[PDB]
Amino acid sequence: VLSFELLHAPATVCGPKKSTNLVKNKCVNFNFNGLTGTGVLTESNKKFL
Amino acid sequence: NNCTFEYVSFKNLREFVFKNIDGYFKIYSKHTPINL
Amino acid sequence: NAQALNTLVKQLSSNFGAISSVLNDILSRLDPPEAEVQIDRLITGRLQS
């Protein structure tokens, strides 16, 4: 028997299910983690931390 | 012990900020080599 | 002209009493009925800007 509980502490076990694949260079609609929008997707040089 | 939360992960200067921002507790940090 | 445009563009970041400054958030969080009051605040704010 597995028990599930939810408290005020941040949950360390997390992660959504599989989603549709990626496309690049085309004009597209997109949704990243709920960030809905429209544009062109490419690689970037951006030095994100 | 009435436990409620648990977690597990002189030329050196280490710097930190501890912020109990009412809504949950934040940590920020840095490490740098420095003069004495 | 740069001070005018970099004010006109930056006013897109303002809430005007809506739930968010970004219209896609409203449309992706709310069904059209409850959204229309929020969108009308952004329309009035961006239009007056």
The DSSP line for A1-49 is: -------SSPPS---PPP------SSEEEEEETTEEEEEE---------
Whether residue C11 contacts residue C3, with contact meaning beta carbons closer than 8 Å, is answered with no
C29 contacts: CB under 8 Å, gap ≥ 6: C19, C20, C35
Query: Which of C26, C27, C28 best tests the A interface by mutation, with the highest count of A CBs <10 A?
Result: C28
Residue A9 to chain B, least CA–CA distance (Å): 6
Breaks in chain B, named by the residue before each, with C–N above 2.5 Å? 9
Residues in chain A: 49
Burial class of residue A30, CB neighbours in 10 A (0-12, 13-18, 19+):
middle
| Distance in angstroms (rounded) separating the CA atoms of residues C46 and C49 | 5
| Distance in angstroms (rounded) separating the CA atoms of residues C20 and B34 | 44
- Confirm or reject contact between C24 and chain A (CB < 8 A): yes
Alpha helices in chain C (DSSP H): 2-8, 23-29, 32-48
Alpha-carbon torsion angle C18, C21, C26, C29, nearest 10: -100
Instruction: State the resolution, in angstroms.
Output: 3.3
| Distance in angstroms (rounded) separating the CA atoms of residues A26 and B6 | 46
A25 contacts: CB under 8 Å, gap ≥ 6: A40, A41, A42
B36 contacts: CB under 8 Å, gap ≥ 6: B10, B11
